[PDB]
DNA sequence: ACGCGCTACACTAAAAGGGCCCTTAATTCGATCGACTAAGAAAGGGCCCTTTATCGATCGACTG
């Protein structure tokens, strides 16, 4: 990732590995809450070309799961990791979300 | 092997998504204007009490 392992505690290293875990296991839902500036969104935005960081919380079942008009599957179809930032900000215009 | 079948453009209709925007029916309040709720009000009014008259009763000089 670019972190210095010798400058971190062992448990912090294992937490960072848990952060890797969503990339390596199929259909792995995981939630992480923490203080600002702890380097959360960096791994899901820079250090992987096959993961997406959904910003702003602007998520609808149309573009996230299945858009019935265009008949194309949403984000969850071609990305290995979908990371919802700003969990407070995520809200669904449709109820079914 | 040059006429022939495919591959490109506007109107009409249907679906769905997504702003979305108005609604509303929930909220706050926030005066507020009654609404009492005492606190002291003052007029008024009501109450009391010592005033004169008299009716004895008597106790007086005075008096014959």
From TrEMBL:
Domain of life: Bacteria
Protein name: Protease Lon-related BREX system protein BrxL
Lineage of the species this protein comes from: Bacteria, Pseudomonadati, Pseudomonadota, Gammaproteobacteria, Moraxellales
Span covered, complete protein: 195 to 291 of 679
């Amino acid at each position: 990732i670019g972190m210095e392992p010798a400058s971190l505690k062992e448990d912090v290293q294992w937490h960072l590995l848990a952060r890797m875990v969503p990339f390596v296991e199929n259909n792995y839902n995981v939630c992480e809450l923490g203080p600002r500036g702890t380097g959360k969104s960096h791994i899901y935005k820079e250090c992987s070309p096959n993961s997406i960081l959904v910003s702003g919380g602007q998520t609808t079942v149309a573009n996230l799961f299945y858009n019935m008009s265009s008949r194309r599957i949403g984000l969850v179809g071609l990305w290995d990791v979908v990371a919802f930032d700003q969990v407070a900000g995520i809200s669904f215009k449709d109820k079914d979300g």
